Tab-separated table of N, CA and C in Angstrom:
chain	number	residue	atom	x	y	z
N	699	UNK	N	107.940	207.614	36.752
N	699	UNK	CA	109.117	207.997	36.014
N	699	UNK	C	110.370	208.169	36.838
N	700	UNK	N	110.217	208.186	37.979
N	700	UNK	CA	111.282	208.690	38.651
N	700	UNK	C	111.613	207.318	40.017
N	701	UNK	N	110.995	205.777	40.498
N	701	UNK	CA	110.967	204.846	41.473
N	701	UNK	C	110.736	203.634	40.605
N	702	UNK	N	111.316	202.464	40.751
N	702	UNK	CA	110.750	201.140	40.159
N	702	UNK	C	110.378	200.639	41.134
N	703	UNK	N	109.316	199.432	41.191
N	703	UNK	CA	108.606	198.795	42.450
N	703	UNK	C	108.453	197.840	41.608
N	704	UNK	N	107.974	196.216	42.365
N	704	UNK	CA	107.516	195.538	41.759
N	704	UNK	C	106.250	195.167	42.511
N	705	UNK	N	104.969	195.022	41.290
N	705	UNK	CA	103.333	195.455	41.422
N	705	UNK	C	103.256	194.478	41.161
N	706	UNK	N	102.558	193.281	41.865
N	706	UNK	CA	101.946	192.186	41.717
N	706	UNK	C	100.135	192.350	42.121
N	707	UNK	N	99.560	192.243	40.930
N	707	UNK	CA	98.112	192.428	41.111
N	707	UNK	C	97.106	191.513	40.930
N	708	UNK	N	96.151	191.732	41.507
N	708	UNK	CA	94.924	190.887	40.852
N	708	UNK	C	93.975	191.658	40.131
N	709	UNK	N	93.274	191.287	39.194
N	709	UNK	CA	92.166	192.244	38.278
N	709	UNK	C	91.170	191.192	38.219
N	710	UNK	N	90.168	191.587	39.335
N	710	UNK	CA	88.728	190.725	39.155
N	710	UNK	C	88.197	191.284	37.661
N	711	UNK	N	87.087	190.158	37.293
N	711	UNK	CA	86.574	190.547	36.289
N	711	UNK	C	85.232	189.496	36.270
N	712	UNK	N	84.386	189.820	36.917
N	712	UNK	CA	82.981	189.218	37.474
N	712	UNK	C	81.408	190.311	37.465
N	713	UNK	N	80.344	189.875	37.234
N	713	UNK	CA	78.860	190.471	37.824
N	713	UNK	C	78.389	190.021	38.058
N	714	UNK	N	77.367	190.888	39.184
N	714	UNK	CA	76.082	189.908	39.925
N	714	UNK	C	74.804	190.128	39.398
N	715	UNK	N	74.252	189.579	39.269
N	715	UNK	CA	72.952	189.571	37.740
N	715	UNK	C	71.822	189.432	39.093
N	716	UNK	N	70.614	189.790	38.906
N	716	UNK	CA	69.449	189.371	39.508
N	716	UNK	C	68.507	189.211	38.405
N	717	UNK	N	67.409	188.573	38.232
N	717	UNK	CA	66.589	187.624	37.663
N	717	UNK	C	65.242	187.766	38.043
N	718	UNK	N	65.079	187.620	39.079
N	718	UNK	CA	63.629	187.773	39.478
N	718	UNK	C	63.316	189.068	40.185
N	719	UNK	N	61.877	189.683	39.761
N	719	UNK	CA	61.290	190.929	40.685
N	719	UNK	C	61.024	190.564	41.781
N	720	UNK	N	60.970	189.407	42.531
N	720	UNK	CA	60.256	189.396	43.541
N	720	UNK	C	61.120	189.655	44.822
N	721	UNK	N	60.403	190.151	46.005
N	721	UNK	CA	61.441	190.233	47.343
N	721	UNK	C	60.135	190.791	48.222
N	722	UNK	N	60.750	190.151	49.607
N	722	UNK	CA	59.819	190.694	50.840
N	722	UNK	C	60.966	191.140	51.762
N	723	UNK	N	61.119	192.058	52.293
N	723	UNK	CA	61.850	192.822	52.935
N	723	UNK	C	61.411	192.965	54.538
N	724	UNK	N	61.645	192.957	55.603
N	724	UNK	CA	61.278	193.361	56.906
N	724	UNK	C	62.678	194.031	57.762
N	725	UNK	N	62.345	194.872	58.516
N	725	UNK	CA	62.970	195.455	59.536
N	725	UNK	C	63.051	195.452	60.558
N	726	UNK	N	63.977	194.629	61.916
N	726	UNK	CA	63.209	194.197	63.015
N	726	UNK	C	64.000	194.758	64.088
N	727	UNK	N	63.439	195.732	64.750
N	727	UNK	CA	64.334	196.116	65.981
N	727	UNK	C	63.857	195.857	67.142
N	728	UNK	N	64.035	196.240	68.387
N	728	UNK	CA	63.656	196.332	69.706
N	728	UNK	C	63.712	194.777	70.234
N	729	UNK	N	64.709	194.233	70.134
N	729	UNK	CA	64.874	193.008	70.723
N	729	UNK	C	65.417	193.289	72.290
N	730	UNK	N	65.796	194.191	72.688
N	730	UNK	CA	66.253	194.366	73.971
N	730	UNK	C	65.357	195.378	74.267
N	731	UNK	N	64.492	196.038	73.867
N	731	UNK	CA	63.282	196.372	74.833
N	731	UNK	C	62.044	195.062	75.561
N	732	UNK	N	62.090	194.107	74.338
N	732	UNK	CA	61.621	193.661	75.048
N	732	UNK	C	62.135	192.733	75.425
N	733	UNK	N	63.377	191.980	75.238
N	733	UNK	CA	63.526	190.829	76.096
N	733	UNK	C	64.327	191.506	77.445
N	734	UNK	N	64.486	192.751	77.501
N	734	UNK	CA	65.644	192.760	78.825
N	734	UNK	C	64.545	193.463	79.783
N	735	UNK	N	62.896	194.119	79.492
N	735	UNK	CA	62.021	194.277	80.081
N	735	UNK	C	60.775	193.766	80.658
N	736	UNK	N	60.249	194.097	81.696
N	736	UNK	CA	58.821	193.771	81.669
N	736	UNK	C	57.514	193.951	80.409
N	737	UNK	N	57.270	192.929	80.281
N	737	UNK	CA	56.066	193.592	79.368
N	737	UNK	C	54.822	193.052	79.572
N	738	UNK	N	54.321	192.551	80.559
N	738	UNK	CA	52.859	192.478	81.103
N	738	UNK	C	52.683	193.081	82.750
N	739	UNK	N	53.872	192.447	83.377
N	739	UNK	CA	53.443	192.833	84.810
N	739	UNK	C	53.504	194.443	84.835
N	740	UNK	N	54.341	195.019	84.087
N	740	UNK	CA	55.063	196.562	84.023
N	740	UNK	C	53.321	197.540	83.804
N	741	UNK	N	52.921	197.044	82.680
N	741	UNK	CA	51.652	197.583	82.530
N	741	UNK	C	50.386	197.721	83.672
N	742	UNK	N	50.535	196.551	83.876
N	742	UNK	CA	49.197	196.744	85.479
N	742	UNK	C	49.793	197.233	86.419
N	743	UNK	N	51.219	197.416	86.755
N	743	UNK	CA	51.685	198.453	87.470
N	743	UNK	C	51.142	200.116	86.881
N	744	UNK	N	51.115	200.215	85.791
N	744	UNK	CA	50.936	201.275	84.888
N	744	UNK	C	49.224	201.842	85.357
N	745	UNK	N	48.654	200.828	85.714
N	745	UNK	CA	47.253	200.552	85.719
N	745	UNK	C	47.065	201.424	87.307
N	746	UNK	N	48.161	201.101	87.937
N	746	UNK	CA	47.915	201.678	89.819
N	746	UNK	C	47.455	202.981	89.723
N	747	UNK	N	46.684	203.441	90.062
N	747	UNK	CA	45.792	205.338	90.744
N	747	UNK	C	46.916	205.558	91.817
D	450	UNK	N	58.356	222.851	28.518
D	450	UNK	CA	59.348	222.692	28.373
D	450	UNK	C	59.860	221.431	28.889
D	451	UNK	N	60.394	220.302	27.593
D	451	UNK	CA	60.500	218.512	28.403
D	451	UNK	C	61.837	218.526	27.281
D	452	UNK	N	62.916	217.785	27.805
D	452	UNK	CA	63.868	217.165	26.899
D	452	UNK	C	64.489	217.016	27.744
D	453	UNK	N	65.576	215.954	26.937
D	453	UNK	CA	66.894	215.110	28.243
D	453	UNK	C	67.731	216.418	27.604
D	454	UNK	N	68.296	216.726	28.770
D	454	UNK	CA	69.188	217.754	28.977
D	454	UNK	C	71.268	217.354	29.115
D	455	UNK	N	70.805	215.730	29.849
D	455	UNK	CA	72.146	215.286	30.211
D	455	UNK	C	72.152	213.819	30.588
D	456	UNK	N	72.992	212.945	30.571
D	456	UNK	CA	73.071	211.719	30.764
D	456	UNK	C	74.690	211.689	31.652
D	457	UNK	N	74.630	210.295	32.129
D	457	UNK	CA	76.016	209.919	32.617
D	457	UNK	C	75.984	208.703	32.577
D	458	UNK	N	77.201	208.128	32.506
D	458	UNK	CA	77.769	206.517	32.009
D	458	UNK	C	78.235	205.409	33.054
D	459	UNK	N	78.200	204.506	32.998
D	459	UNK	CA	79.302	203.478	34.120
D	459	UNK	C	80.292	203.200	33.233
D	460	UNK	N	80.552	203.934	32.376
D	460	UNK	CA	81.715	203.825	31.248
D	460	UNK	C	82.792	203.666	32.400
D	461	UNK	N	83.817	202.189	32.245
D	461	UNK	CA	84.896	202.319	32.511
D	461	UNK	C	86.177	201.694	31.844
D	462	UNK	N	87.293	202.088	31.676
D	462	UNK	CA	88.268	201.400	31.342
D	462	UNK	C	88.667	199.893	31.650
D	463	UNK	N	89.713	199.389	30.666
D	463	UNK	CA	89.700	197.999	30.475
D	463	UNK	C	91.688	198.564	31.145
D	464	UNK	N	92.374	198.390	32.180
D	464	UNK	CA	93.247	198.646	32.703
D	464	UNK	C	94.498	197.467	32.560
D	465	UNK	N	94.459	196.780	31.016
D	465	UNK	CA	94.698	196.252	30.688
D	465	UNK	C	96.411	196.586	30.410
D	466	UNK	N	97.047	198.039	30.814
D	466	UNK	CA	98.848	198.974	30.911
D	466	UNK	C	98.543	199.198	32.412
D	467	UNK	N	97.801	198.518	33.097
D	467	UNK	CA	98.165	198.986	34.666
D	467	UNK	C	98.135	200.705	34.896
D	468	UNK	N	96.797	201.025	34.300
D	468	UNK	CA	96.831	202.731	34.515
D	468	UNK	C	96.208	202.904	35.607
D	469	UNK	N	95.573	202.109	36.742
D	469	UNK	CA	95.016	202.326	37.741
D	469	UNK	C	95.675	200.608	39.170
D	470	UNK	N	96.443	200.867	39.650
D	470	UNK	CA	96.295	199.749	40.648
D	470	UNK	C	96.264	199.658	41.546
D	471	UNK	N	94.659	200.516	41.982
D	471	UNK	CA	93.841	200.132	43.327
D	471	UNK	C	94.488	200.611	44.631
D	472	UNK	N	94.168	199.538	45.321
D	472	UNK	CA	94.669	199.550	46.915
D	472	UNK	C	96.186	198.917	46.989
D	473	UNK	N	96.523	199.097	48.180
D	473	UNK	CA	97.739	198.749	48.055
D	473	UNK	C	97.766	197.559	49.417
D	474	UNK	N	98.574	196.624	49.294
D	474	UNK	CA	98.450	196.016	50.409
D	474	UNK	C	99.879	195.908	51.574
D	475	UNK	N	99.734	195.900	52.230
D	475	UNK	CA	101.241	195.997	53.041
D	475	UNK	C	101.320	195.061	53.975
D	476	UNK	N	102.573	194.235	54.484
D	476	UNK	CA	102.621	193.451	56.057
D	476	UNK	C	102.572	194.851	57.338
D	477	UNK	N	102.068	194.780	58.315
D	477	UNK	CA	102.155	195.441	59.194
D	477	UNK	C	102.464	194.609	60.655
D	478	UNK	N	103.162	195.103	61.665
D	478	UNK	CA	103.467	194.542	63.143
D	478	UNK	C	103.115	195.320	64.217
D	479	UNK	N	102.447	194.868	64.811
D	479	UNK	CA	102.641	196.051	66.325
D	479	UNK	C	103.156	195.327	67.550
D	480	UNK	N	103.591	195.898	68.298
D	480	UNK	CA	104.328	195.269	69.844
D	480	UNK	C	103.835	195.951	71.260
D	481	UNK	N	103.360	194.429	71.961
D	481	UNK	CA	102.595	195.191	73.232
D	481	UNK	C	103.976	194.364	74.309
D	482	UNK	N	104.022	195.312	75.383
D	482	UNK	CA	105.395	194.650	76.556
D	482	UNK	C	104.441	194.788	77.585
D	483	UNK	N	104.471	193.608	78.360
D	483	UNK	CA	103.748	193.582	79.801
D	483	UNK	C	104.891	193.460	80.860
D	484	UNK	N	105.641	194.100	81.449
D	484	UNK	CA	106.454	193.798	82.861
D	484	UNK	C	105.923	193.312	83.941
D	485	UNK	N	106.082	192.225	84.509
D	485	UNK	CA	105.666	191.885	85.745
D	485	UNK	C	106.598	192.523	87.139
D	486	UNK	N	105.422	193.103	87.922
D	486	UNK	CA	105.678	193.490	89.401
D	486	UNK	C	106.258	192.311	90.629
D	487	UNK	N	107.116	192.798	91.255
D	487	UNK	CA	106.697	192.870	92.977
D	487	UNK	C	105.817	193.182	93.417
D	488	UNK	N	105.217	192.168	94.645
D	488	UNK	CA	103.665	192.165	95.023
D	488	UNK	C	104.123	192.412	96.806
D	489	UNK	N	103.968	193.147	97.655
D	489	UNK	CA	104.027	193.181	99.031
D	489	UNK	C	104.142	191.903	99.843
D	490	UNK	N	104.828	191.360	100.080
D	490	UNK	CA	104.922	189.991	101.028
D	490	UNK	C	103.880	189.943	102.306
D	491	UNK	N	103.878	188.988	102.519
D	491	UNK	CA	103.717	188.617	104.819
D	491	UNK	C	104.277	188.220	105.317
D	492	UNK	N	104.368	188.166	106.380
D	492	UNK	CA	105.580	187.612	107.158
D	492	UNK	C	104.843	186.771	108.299
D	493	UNK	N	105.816	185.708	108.770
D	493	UNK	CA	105.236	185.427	109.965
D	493	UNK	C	106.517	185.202	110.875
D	494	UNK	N	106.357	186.373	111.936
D	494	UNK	CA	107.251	186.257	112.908
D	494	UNK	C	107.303	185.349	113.815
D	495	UNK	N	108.806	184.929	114.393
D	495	UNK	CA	108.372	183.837	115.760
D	495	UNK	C	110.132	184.192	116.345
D	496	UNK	N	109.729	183.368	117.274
D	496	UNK	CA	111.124	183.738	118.656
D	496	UNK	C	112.167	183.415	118.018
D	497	UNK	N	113.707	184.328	118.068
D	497	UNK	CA	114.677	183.643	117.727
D	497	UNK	C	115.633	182.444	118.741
D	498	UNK	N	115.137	182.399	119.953
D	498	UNK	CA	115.995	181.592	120.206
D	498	UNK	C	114.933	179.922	120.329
């Protein structure tokens, strides 16, 4: 009531539907444990008395 | 003791008088100045005459 501006907008008007129950899901971490480590020789070190 | 007690909606308006318009978008600038130095010389002395 009190500033005029001029408002140029966009108004989406879209949905995302899914269809099927099915899904397999996995979670995968530790890529830099093991690629930036030992992981066989480290162990028979592990192995030394 | 079992009964629906309360519900809630994704009821939303059709913003069809511009009663809601969102985000706003703006141009923005920023300014970086690099001055370049004087670096210590060498010299190579020799006889003046």
């Amino acid at each position: 009531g009190h500033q005029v501006t001029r408002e140029i907008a966009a108004i989406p008007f879209n949905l995302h539907v899914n269809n099927i129950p099915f899904a397999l899901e996995f979670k995968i971490t530790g890529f830099q444990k093991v690629m930036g480590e030992t992981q066989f020789n480290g162990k028979l070190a592990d192995l030394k008395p | 003791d079992l009964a629906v007690i309360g519900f809630e909606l994704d009821t939303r308006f059709t913003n069809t008088n511009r009663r809601q318009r969102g985000h706003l978008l703006q141009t923005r600038a920023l300014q970086f100045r690099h001055p370049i130095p004087m670096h210590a010389p060498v010299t190579l002395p020799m006889d003046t005459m």
